[PDB]
């Protein structure tokens, strides 16, 4: 049942941590941030050219976060891959460590701070988010075998809560071709080769065999199937990893107590959606849009829903509407008890969103953080 003595499960729409020996159960909330870099060709979380890695973890904790989503790529979790771009004067205890060793060191230190870790298979290779969980040179079997290896190793760390199976399933063409051309993810189309709802079951089953105590986080797609997507006026305008409209009629076939749906959602800094125009009702139109794309998965169906990525520049060198957008989203999350989330990102080096840290990798954006802090109390 568990190699750590700790077992994670969902009961209703809440995540619990169970100590299997004592029988003690505690509901947990995830007040999270994404710290990315292991999925990039740096092969290590970013910022270690400017900061000490432990200081970073301490700072994250000091802000009241208790969870980190950690993107990785295939090579970052294999022995022998060397990190690039670390200032070893500020990080002397990382000298001579490969990427995998640094990942273990970070997760252990997070655990010491009571910080939960969600592992996110973010890129197959270190360059770009593929739309599917396989490529020409890298098969679904390869992808699954990588998850198995990761689950066996990291399943031993008590604070690792589970697996975000694939970052942002999406499409690289427009409907109608996106549903049939084999280049992008679908949901409820019926073809198990492209249907993310079916692949997630296959990948999830394999992971739970070796890490039965983990949770399986399943993101949305961009498009699902034409019947579902056409059933709503903004059906073709969901984010990558953000379309959960097909969950109702095409649920992922995995145990209810292990499954967490994990939509991504973004504001005008990422894309100028038509619905961000005051002409189309911005921002009072937003709750119904969020509700349709993903919110109903919790509010109507009662699944656990954890927002896996959301963020924006909050008016710092971006679209000023982003301030209104992030405020409205936080208001809505509070009102509707979406208490579990991972903000994108801790890193400032995200082109279209910036992060919680400013470009100096040291000082935070006080206003952006103050808004976020409302979710943590």
Residue numbers in the entry: 34 to 410
What does the primary publication say about this deposited structure?
To investigate a role of the disulfide bond in the activity and stability of the enzyme, we prepared 3 mutants of EGPh; P74C, C106S, and P74C/C106S, in which we removed the disulfide bond or changed the disulfide-bonding pattern. The mutant P74C/C106S possesses 2 Cys residues at the region and is expected to form a disulfide bond (C74–C159) structurally similar to that of EGAc (C34–C120). Moreover, as expected, the P74C/C106S mutation possesses an identical disulfide bond (C74–C159) conserved in EGAc. The crystal structural analysis of EGPh mutants revealed that a new disulfide bond at the position of P74 is formed in P74C and P74C/C106S. No significant change in the enzymatic activity at 80 °C was observed between the mutants and the wild type (data not shown), suggesting that the region involving the disulfide bond did not significantly influence substrate-binding or catalysis. All of the mutants showed a dramatic decrease in residual activity after heat treatment compared with the wild type. The wild type enzyme was thermally unfolded at 103.4 °C. The melting temperature of the 3 mutants was approximately 101.5 °C. These results indicate that the alternative new disulfide-bonding pattern involved in the position of P74 did not contribute to its hyperthermostability. However, the thermal analysis indicates that the C106–C159 bond with higher potential energy contributes to thermostability while the C74–C159 bond has no role in stability.
